[PDB]
Amino acid sequence: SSLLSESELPAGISYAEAMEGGSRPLLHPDNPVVFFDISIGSHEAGRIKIELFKNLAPKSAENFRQFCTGEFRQNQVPIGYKGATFHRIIKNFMIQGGDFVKGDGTGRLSIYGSSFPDEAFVLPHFRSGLLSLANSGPDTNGCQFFITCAKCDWLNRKHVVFGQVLGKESMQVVRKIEHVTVDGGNRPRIPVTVTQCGEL
Amino acid sequence: XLLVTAGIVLA
């Protein structure tokens, strides 16, 4: 099994280590670090910085990275996470977003085509603050993602964990998003938007 | 329940 147990994890990805992170990667020196500036309704909430684990999940990292910088063009139009939202929020579980196509969880597009396969399932969903791919079954990754708000190992081997948030502010912003009021479908009553994003 | 799908969220 490629899935690492929690005692076999590489240096740089414990909660304590990630919370001491700045704007440079902790797991491998060539990992990109990207950011989202988040607004909740009309209220700026702060910035989430995210290390993408190119060393473990290069295709997943590069897809997310291009959607952060606006580098990817669809029909010659840049498309990505700027203006995208967190459309499904479940307190004590995770925050899900990145559906820039439809804004509701139905959208799927990647830099590789409509979907892309699962990379190796190396890391478990062992703690809060991890970035993982949303999908609709095997080999259906696209643009959506989630950030864990708790341990959620029942997702292991079904979703590729491909990044981690860096620094205390990042987690504070995640927790703010996690606690917004939601409707019966777990959709926030006031939109949670990536107003700006890019690479550090 | 507590999955993270894209299209038909299950229980």
Residue numbers in the entry:
A (entry chain A): 12 to 211
B (entry chain D): 1 to 11
Quote the study that presented this structure, word for word.
Recently, we characterized TgCyp23 among the various Cyps of the parasite, demonstrating its high PPIase activity and its ability to bind cyclosporin A (CsA), a well‐known inhibitor of Cyps (Favretto et al., 2023). TgCyp23 exhibits the typical eight‐stranded antiparallel β‐barrel structure, with two α‐helices flanking the barrel on either side, all of them connected by loops. TgCyp23 shows remarkable sequence identity with human CypA (~52% of identity) but has a 40‐aminoacid N‐terminal extension. Here, three new structures of the protein in complex with the three non‐immunosuppressive derivatives NIM811, dhCsA, and Alisporivir have been solved at 1.17, 1.20, and 1.20 Å resolution, respectively.
